[PDB]
């Protein structure tokens, strides 16, 4: 997954969101865990918009 | 906050799509409501505070 980082509380698994509401959807509690990767400086692009 | 001074809003058609409609628009969903069912819900006498 690939997404902004503003609104990764709203379209968090089992919550409505933004993004949640346009393509993905999970189920009510799905046994999965969600893991989100906090990139700081160097995975972040600064050259292509 | 201490104004507390606005227009008032009532017996106006609550679609929810105009909230969608503007671009700076971000927030619309309730904590203890889903808003899919929200999209049709209706209120009275619902007045946003200044």
Redesign the interface.
Same mark, same amino acid.
């Given at each position: 997954f690939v997404i902004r980082g503003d609104e990764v509380r709203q379209i968090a698994p089992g919550q409505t969101g933004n993004i949640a509401d346009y393509n993905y959807k999970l189920p009510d509690d799905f046994t999965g865990c969600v893991i989100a990767w906090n990139s700081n400086k160097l995975d972040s692009k600064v050259s292509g918009n | 906050v201490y104004a507390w001074n606005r227009k008032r809003i009532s017996n106006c058609v609550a679609d929810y799509s105009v909230l969608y409609n503007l671009a700076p628009f971000? $927030?619309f969903?309730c904590y203890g409501v889903?808003? $899919?069912k929200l999209n049709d819900l209706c209120f009275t006498n619902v007045y946003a505070d200044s």
């Open positions: - | 971000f $927030t969903k889903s808003p $899919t």
